[PDB]
Amino acid sequence: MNPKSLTRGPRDKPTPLEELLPHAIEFINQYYGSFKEAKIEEHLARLEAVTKEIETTGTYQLTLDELIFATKMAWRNAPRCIGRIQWSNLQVFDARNCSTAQEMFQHICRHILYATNNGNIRSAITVFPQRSDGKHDFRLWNSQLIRYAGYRGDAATLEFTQLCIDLGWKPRYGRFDVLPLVLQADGQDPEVFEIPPDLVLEVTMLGLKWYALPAVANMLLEVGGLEFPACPFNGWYMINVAVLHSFQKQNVTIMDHHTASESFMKHMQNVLSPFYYYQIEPWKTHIWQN
Amino acid sequence: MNPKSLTRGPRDKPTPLEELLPHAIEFINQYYGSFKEAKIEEHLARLEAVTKEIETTGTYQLTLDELIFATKMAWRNAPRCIGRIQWSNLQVFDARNCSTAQEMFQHICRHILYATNNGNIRSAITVFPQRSDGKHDFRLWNSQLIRYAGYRGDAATLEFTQLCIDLGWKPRYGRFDVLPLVLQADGQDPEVFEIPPDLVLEVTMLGLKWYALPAVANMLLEVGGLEFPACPFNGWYMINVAVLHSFQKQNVTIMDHHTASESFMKHMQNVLSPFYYYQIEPWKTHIWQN
Ligand code: HEM
Ligand code: HEM
Ligand SMILES: Cc1cc(Oc2ccc3c(c2)OCO3)nc(Oc2ccc(-n3ccnc3)cc2)n1
Ligand SMILES: Cc1cc(Oc2ccc3c(c2)OCO3)nc(Oc2ccc(-n3ccnc3)cc2)n1
Incomplete structure (x- = not known):
């Protein structure tokens, strides 16, 4: 077997331009490929601008549309996420x-x-500034x-x-x-x-309760060779029936059959990379x- | 002479409770003894809980603090390890x-x-699940x-x-x-x-090179009668001067005088059992x- 590491660690130096360039180019292709026959000349113009930016500044900035696309594709690429079937239902907050x-x-x-x-x-994700030299x-x-x-x-x-x-x-x-x-x-x-x-x-189930919002705070988004080490996101929750009853009774979203259907209906009305490490x-x- | 075996072999059955109990008690004493005059009532409460656990489940689980203490004392108890002079500099990953x-x-x-x-x-150690019946x-x-x-x-x-x-x-x-x-x-x-x-x-010294991380993969940690047959750990390396030069030149830690001093300075700013077999x-x- 040749599995990849699911962990992406710290750096003490900027990503070398010889590594970054190819990854950026490949992401730009994936993005413009989602237009198929359209925008060949825009694709080429973006490739040229990204390269000059990398060659002059040492890195590059995604457009907002590119970042939104990236967060949704990384969600789609999440192996164990049951929620990824409706990956188009995601709100992005840009905090770069x-x-x-x-x-x-x-x-x-x-x-x-x-x-x-x-x-x-x-469901939402908030994206903080990308990694520079790894020291900030x-x-x-x-x-x-x-x-x-x-x-x-x-x-x-x-x-x-x-x-x-x-x-x-x-x-x-x-x-x-x-x-x-x-x-x-x-x-x-x-x-x-x-x-x-x-x-x-909080949802109250003895004095038992739990918080309603499951939000992962600690993962890293990778896209086109860029790394975002701060990008919290959330979905909703998936002897035990007490909870299923209490959330519904209190009108808090969980992934029951009704919700699975409606969220999917809304979606349809709309090395892996990008990826959450x-x-x-x-x-x-x-x-x-x- | 009456040396002990440095090897600890397989089992096909769980450790008998009459053997496990005394060893657990003795380890709990060593742990709480590292507080001297403090925590006599906590010590007694832990003895009581460990016994009930062993008597009802056939075994017991260490607390995270107890496991961290155990890995450091077993390192301290390692006869030939030159690194053990700075035993407090150890990162533990709990994979139980x-x-x-x-x-x-x-x-x-x-x-x-x-x-x-x-x-x-x-330096780090990763601890996998303890032995149960010896068949898993x-x-x-x-x-x-x-x-x-x-x-x-x-x-x-x-x-x-x-x-x-x-x-x-x-x-x-x-x-x-x-x-x-x-x-x-x-x-x-x-x-x-x-x-x-x-x-x-890898450090490049003809085409000669070597890997930078010396990590022992195959030993067993013993503590309070429990056995962990999977617990990889690492330190750093200790006609020949070519290597000493190449590691320093490439900024890879070895045990030279500067490193011996600094790692010791950091430490100070912070049958044998527990033991690695x-x-x-x-x-x-x-x-x-x-
Ligand atoms: C809409 C509700 C969502 C549901 C019901 C859902 C459900 C799940 C579940 C059940 C897991 C497995 C956790 C476990 O092993 O216990 C998971 C993992 C994960 N989810 Fe979600 N999720 C949702 C939204 C999101 C969003 C919005 C993102 C990111 C934009 C996301 C990214 C991930 C990632 C990266 C993992 C780990 C994947 C892996 O390690 O294989 N999820 N999710
Ligand atoms: C920080 C760097 C470290 C150095 C420089 C170091 C150095 C050494 C050396 C030179 C030996 C003798 C090997 C031989 O005979 O060729 C040794 C053995 C050993 N080391 Fe380390 N070590 C370090 C870290 C660790 C750590 C982190 C642990 C465990 C937590 C550890 C546990 C042991 C054990 C169990 C042995 C075998 C002891 C024996 O059989 O007597 N060492 N170490
Ligand atoms: C011990 C424990 C228990 C739970 O409970 C769950 C279980 C399943 C699930 C949850 C929380 O949210 C989406 O599906 N969550 C966590 O942490 C998480 C994991 C994933 C998670 N998540 C949100 C969106 N996608 C994954 C939120 C919180 N830890
Ligand atoms: C033939 C050979 C040669 C070497 O080279 C050394 C020699 C001394 C040393 C090493 C590797 O790491 C710490 O001190 N290691 C091994 O295997 C080991 C032994 C011990 C070891 N170790 C790491 C931490 N403590 C001991 C790592 C790798 N085999």
């Missing part, structure tokens, strides 16, 4: 001009707001945007919870404490941000500056 | 929930990535993660190379062919996985199912 952690925070609040939509969940990465240290702390609590976040504590987050001691956002901008040490409680929608946990690789 | 060979492969890719770090080598062992059949094939090539891998061939691996015939990973999961027949070439960093080569003991 973001510069600070405070700004990252505001972008994520907007994402959570739009995607939760009072319970009528919508944007990263979300959380694995999901919304997740409970573990001390009592979620057993699988003991490590990250302790980390938030080490960073000056005050630990409550319930079993449903929503962890803070831990946000790295421009390669700096991360900063801790409480999520405004009113942004977190896993990353190495940033607290294992980060060099602290203070 | 791994179930398939494809999954083992992805864990090892991640390990190789993190540890190589573009040449700035970091996880094992790496390689002796090191990275090693060259021998036909022409490395003279000391003729046997393993032939084995890879017998298993359907296509033999090149250079003298620097990187062997495939041969991975056993859940006691099944091993599967063969090519290592992605870009994951293998040797094993019997698995192709000598494995019963094939197909």
Whole structure:
């Protein structure tokens, strides 16, 4: 067998132009190929402009339409995602001009707001600035945007919870404490941000509940040789029947037969690359500056 | 003399509870003893919970903190390891929930990535699921993660190379062919996985070169009576001066005076058991199912 690694790690230098160029060209082909017989002269003009940009600046910028296409094809290329059958239903938020952690925070609040939509969940992705030299990465240290702390609590976040504590987050001691956002901008040490409680929608099932929005915070989007290490996205959720009942009763989207049908109906009315990679946990690789 | 065996062999049955219990208790003591005067009541609570677990399930699970402590103490207890002077500099990857060979492969890719770090080598260990009845062992059949094939090539891998061939691996015939990973999961027949070439960093010294990452693939970690037969780890390397020059020139970590000092400085800023045992080569003991 010759499987590929599903993980894409850090760099300390910009991608060499001899590597970047061929990948960019191949992506540009995939993009314009989605027009088949149309736009041959536009295709050629874009190839020429991308090359000059790479040769003069060392890298290049995608157009908004190219980025939207990229996020949807990478979703389509996601092997285990059951949601990818309706890949055209995706809202993109372009945050490639973001510069600070405070700004990252505001972008994520907007994402959570739009995607939760009072319970009528919508799929979205927010794209932060692409990697440059690898020393100025944007990263979300959380694995999901919304997740409970573990001390009592979620057993699988003991490590990250302790980390938030080490960073000056005050630990409550319930079993449903929503962890803070831990946000790295421009390669700096991360900063801790409480999520405004009113942004977190929960479904009550004894005192049992769970958050409504499943959003992956920690993967990397690759496209045409460019890498975006910060690109949170969300879908909706897929002895056990209590939950299926509680979400429907409370009008929160899950992937039941009705939803599978309607979301597919909406879709129809509309080495793999591009691709979403896993990353190495940033607290294992980060060099602290203070 | 009464030396102990440095080898720990296979089982066909779970460890008897009368043997496991005392060993678990002694390890729990060693762990909480590293707090001296603190945590007497936590110590007692953990003893009680471990016993009930063993008495009801036949075995027990370490906490993440206990596993990290165990891997570092076993390194400290390694008689011939020169690296053990800085035993606190060790990154642990917890893979105890791994179930398939494809999954083992992805864990090892991640390990190789993190540890190589573009040449700035970091020590790491990846821990796979502990032994249960001895019939479902996880094992790496390689002796090191990275090693060259021998036909022409490395003279000391003729046997393993032939084995890879017998298993359907296509033999090149250079003298620097990187062997495939041969991975056993859940006691099944091993599967063969090519290592992605870009994951293998080499130092060029005539056409002479060598791989940068020395990683032992085939030992067993023992702790509190539990056995982990799959736990690859790595450090860095220790008429001959050509190599010492080439690694430094190419910015790949070796154990020279500068590195000895800095790694020790970082450490200070931070029957033996636990212990790493040797094993019997698995192709000598494995019963094939197909
Ligand atoms: C609309 C709702 C969606 C549903 C119901 C859905 C469902 C799933 C499920 C069930 C998994 C497997 C997780 C597991 O192993 O437990 C998965 C994985 C994943 N999903 Fe989604 N998803 C949705 C939306 C999205 C979106 C919007 C994206 C990205 C734009 C996406 C990207 C991925 C990726 C990259 C993985 C991992 C794939 C892999 O490792 O093979 N999903 N999804
Ligand atoms: C940081 C770099 C490290 C260096 C420079 C280093 C160096 C060495 C050397 C020179 C040997 C003797 C090999 C021989 O006989 O040729 C050795 C053996 C060994 N090392 Fe390391 N090591 C390092 C990291 C590690 C790590 C991370 C572990 C485990 C967590 C480890 C565990 C062992 C074990 C179990 C042996 C065999 C000990 C014995 O049989 O007496 N080493 N190491
Ligand atoms: C232990 C655990 C349990 C769950 O619960 C699920 C299970 C299945 C599923 C979920 C969450 O969202 C889409 O389909 N999620 C996670 O983390 C995830 C994984 C994937 C995920 N996702 C969103 C869109 N695509 C994948 C969200 C949250 N961890
Ligand atoms: C014939 C041969 C030659 C070498 O070369 C060395 C020698 C010394 C050394 C090495 C590799 O890594 C740490 O110190 N390694 C091996 O296999 C090993 C042994 C130990 C080893 N190791 C890594 C960490 N601790 C021990 C890695 C690879 N075999």
